[PDB]
């Protein structure tokens, strides 16, 4: 009824608040008040719709180490469909949907859910799960390297072909793929 409805809308709008302040106490206060159920599922897709919400806050929740973060953060990496996209391609979408946290040990956790997700959307692409993770964060490095003015010397093509060999199993990866990623980000920085 309208009353119910009404009261519910606010306390959503609560909520969101709530969670952007701390994205835990935020999630409490929605589960609680029967607004979002509480599976990993559910709550990787509030997070992902992202309406209202801080993407720090999201990164920040993602990045927890308990279990239920872990798994809403395998669920949230599900909800992207990476099929027939580029590594940058599928990098850009994954990175609009939340700010990655500062720390080491989750950006890692958040990257590698990121490459076993890209290989399996995209089988022929890497044989190889480390191979998409290192060239992940040469991609995101040289975003930085080309569209930062601090970084004085841009690297050309050849030397980020040179940068990368090895890494395809000990052989190299198709020089194309790398002219294809390097253009890319040459003409498009990421998003900010």
Same mark, same amino acid.
């Given at each position: 009824?309208? !009353?119910?409805?009404? @009261? ?14 701390? %994205?835990?106490?935020?999630? @409490? $206060? ?9 599976? %990993? ?26 279990? =239920?973060?872990?798994? &809403? ?14 590594? &940058? ?8 949907? $939340? ?5 080491? @040990? ?7 859910? $990121?490459?076993?997700?890209?290989? =399996?959307?995209? %089988?022929?692409? $890497? @044989? ?5 993770? &290192? =060239? !992940? ?7 930085? !390297? ?7 010397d841009k690297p050309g093509l050849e030397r980020f072909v040179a940068m990368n ?18 253009? !890319? ?8």
């Amino acid at each position: 009824h309208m !009353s119910k409805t009404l @009261q519910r809308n606010r306390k959503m709008a609560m909520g969101r608040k709530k969670f952007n302040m701390d %994205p835990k106490k935020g999630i @409490q $206060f929605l589960v609680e008040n029967e607004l979002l159920q509480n599976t %990993p599922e559910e709550i990787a897709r509030f997070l992902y719709k992202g309406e209202g919400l801080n993407k720090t806050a999201i990164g920040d929740y993602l990045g927890e180490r308990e279990e =239920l973060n872990l798994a &809403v953060l395998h669920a949230f990496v599900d909800l992207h469909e990476f099929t027939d996209l580029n590594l &940058v391609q599928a990098l850009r979408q994954f990175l609009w949907s $939340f700010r990655l946290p500062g720390e080491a @040990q989750k950006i890692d956790r958040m990257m590698e859910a $990121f490459a076993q997700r890209y290989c =399996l959307c995209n %089988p022929g692409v $890497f @044989q190889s799960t480390d191979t998409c993770y &290192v =060239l !992940s964060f040469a991609v995101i490095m040289l975003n930085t !390297s080309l569209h930062n003015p601090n970084v004085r010397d841009k690297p050309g093509l050849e030397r980020f072909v040179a940068m990368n060999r090895g890494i395809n199993e000990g052989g190299d990866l198709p020089e194309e793929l790398l002219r294809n990623l390097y253009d !890319s980000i040459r003409n498009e920085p990421f998003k900010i």
